[PDB]
Design a protein around this ligand. Sequence first.
Ligand SMILES: O=C(NCc1cccc(-c2cn3c(n2)CCC3)c1)c1ccccc1
Length: 304
Amino acid sequence: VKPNYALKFTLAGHTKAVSSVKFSPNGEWLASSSADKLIKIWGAYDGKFEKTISGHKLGISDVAWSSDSNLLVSASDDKTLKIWDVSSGKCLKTLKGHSNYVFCCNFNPQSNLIVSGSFDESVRIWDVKTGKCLKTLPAHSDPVSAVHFNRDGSLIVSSSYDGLCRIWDTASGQCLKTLIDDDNPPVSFVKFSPNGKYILAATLDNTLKLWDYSKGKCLKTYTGHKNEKYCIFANFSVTGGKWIVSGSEDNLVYIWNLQTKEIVQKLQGHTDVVISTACHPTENIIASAALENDKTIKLWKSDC
Ligand SMILES: O=C(NCc1cccc(-c2cn3c(n2)CCC3)c1)c1ccccc1
């Protein structure tokens, strides 16, 4: 079986490269962040522009939703994260502590915590309600490219240009695992599978790998796309067929069969690197976004 994703809407409005798009957990909204220092909110189903959220002093590299879909956190080159109340647009808290660009962020499922990763090579864990940093983890020896909580928030996974993926105990901050295969090219993205059994890791040798974390072994490898320079988001698609989804430096969205690792679709339309993809939580919808020469977000829909 293959999906049949087809372009439905193109969302224009950012005036510089888009950085990261994310669907709200309740399925109603898409948030985007950009090098233009703005967050924008769009309807998930119709692509209709809703509102702009502003306040960072420099470009934004990542954005993430709270579990109740009411808050956003953003990660900026201005070395801060901000927590936003989406309905009012108010910045609730500015999270200060990183000493260089903040590149990646996420809420835990309970959404009482935020995890962040930075060019300062650290991973930080923040309290949402106080805005204070609870822990600084000496996570890596190069910039941190991604951070993600597992399904019950007990674990954090991080990746770095140092070629490592590491698993952290949220409560204690201790490093539980370092994953390394036969080589250690820069790791440009990582996230847990929905069931929390696996980890999907991208490396800058045009490769994605599915790891059994607990046993510390690689199970699957996905190739055919181009990824040697940029930190591109990747996803598990689980609403229909079971796919791996990623952007690519040849301006396409790639979709693989998770099991057989074969490419099942390549989505054409963007005019620059597809830096970010996201999968809708209940419908077969993909959002994609591209860098400076394109500036648009695209919504694609499949019947399976
Ligand atoms: O990937 C890069 N730039 C493209 C870009 C721009 C804005 C956001 C992102 C981004 C954020 N996150 C990711 N990519 C993966 C997980 C979090 C990348 C990059 C920038 C400086 C040195 C090495 C690589």
